[PDB]
Curated annotation (Swiss-Prot), chains A, B:
This is 14-3-3 protein zeta/delta. The keyword Cytoplasm applies. SUPFAM superfamilies: 14-3-3 protein (SSF48445). It comes from Homo sapiens (Human). The modification N6-acetyllysine is found at K2, K67.
Length: 240, 240
């Protein structure tokens, strides 16, 4: 039965019907067995497109709400619709967080798995934080940081600095500092350290995932360029 | 109340939440009053993106179903999922066709409106025909052709050959002949006549919609180029 669900999930992915895809992989998860790396990635892809649609819509409607200041009639329309989108967004995140607490994190035997799922837990509390309302926000932010931190400690011990999951964790944990805690200095430090540590040990890349590692390293440096304001003029060869 | 619904529909359009958009304009339609040209276009846009998502998914899963011939295990998966998508697709089309019969077509006072809605009726029976199963298909195909034909007769009498609705009707009625009746000769004749008649009376374009007319004329000629196999080599100036 779980193989049928996985194949239908792959079929929904091709059709770009990500609600179906998430439903299929939710059923697989609820069977209780530890997910394979394929199943783990299908669940991740599915719920990143389900929640992503609400995050995109939320940003559009928030922008309209802000640009209709002094137009109370239009701004009330935007505010109420934003709150409708937020409700959908929370239900998705709570759905993911339940699966992580009840099934994925407890059944994670290998270190790679538990970093993946704790990073995922940090992500979906971060998405809740993006739309949180002051009082509840504090607790949501703490839950996100605690998940990121435990994942950070495990991956630092068990993984090479070039591992894609370790790099991807640094990418998102840095963004958490920059966007949620409004701490760009801590965010840049985290991103620079992870990039530097990977550049140092490039010999520890594997053929199975050197393309993924190098993409995430480029994303890390892109965020640094964005956050520090570097570049803008074409470079010419020069020594280090 | 209808102005609030229209504004929320415009808000859903910007957020690309087309289910919401269709729901808003369905409520507006069900109020019974004749729709303005703005409301008419919002309803059209909304349901063309709702049904379009199913048509796109249907084509992906149909292609996988065809490419898994001789792989009965995978092909059964695709077939069943295709049939799930078809059920959603029919419910959308029946929803539109109900609105057209109960509200839009009866309340259409001006000729431009009744051509628009009869063209729309031909479209959504055409979408049903795209997924119909032999016995029911005949009746569905007849309903589509009858709607297109009545729209064709009204627009020929009341509209200039450059009017976007008249041109758009020719574009879809031709595609109906090519794809549903498998009659490329009749399809090309219909498209060429409409293009030629518009080229003849270019002086009858208006500033309010000359860009739309010229786009549809280009679509008409594109289909002709596709269906006759014309072109392929760069042209040089030469007399007519």
């Amino acid at each position: 039965d779980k193989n049928e669900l996985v194949q239908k999930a792959k079929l929904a992915e091709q059709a770009e019907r990500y609600d179906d895809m998430a439903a299929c992989m939710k059923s697989v998860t609820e069977q209780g067995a530890e997910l394979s790396n394929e199943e783990r990635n299908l669940l991740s892809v599915a719920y990143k497109n389900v929640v992503g649609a609400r995050r995109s819509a939320w940003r559009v409607v928030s922008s309209i709400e802000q640009k209709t200041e002094g137009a109370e009639k239009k701004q009330q329309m935007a505010r109420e619709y934003r709150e409708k989108i937020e409700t959908e967004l929370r239900d998705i995140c709570n759905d993911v967080l339940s699966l992580l607490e009840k099934f994925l994190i407890p059944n994670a035997s290998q270190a790679e798995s538990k970093v993946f799922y704790l990073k995922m837990k940090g992500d979906y509390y971060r998405y809740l934080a993006e739309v949180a309302a002051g009082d509840d926000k504090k607790g949501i932010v703490d839950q996100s940081q605690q998940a990121y931190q435990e994942a950070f400690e495990i991956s630092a011990a068990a993984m090479q600095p070039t591992h894609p999951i370790r790099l991807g964790l640094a990418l998102n944990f840095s963004v958490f500092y920059y966007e949620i805690l409004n701490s760009p200095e801590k965010a840049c430090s985290l991103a620079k350290t992870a990039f530097d540590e990977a550049i140092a040990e490039l010999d520890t890349l594997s053929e199975e995932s050197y393309k993924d590692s190098t993409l995430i390293m480029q994303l890390l440096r892109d965020n640094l360029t964005l956050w520090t304001g570097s570049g803008g003029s074409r470079h010419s060869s020069y020594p280090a």
